[PDB]
Amino acid sequence: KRPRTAFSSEQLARLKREFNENRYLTERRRQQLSSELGLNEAQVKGWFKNMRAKIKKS
């Protein structure tokens, strides 16, 4: 099982800025964003997945 991580405030600000433009990730955009933030792609994919579900519930 993949470890849970905590995102820094800079990572969360960049993620959210991104989610504000498009709630879905293409492959290239995921790679770029994971590389830029120093995050595993699975963590990024996961954050977007959970954020869609939180905002759908909100």
Judge contact between 7 and 15, C-beta under 8 A: yes
Q: What's the rounded Cα separation, in Å, for the pair 47 and 24? A: 11
Least distance in Å: CB of 44 to DNA? 9
Least distance in Å: CB of 41 to DNA? 8
Closest residue by Cα to residue 28 from 44, 16, 17, 14: 44
* Type of residue numbered 58: S
Select from 9, 38, 56, 58 the one that contacts DNA (CB under 7 A). 56
Q: Is 13 in the site for DNA (CB under 7 A)?
A: no
List of residues contacting DNA (CB under 7 A): 1-7, 12, 24-25, 27, 30, 42-43, 45-54, 56
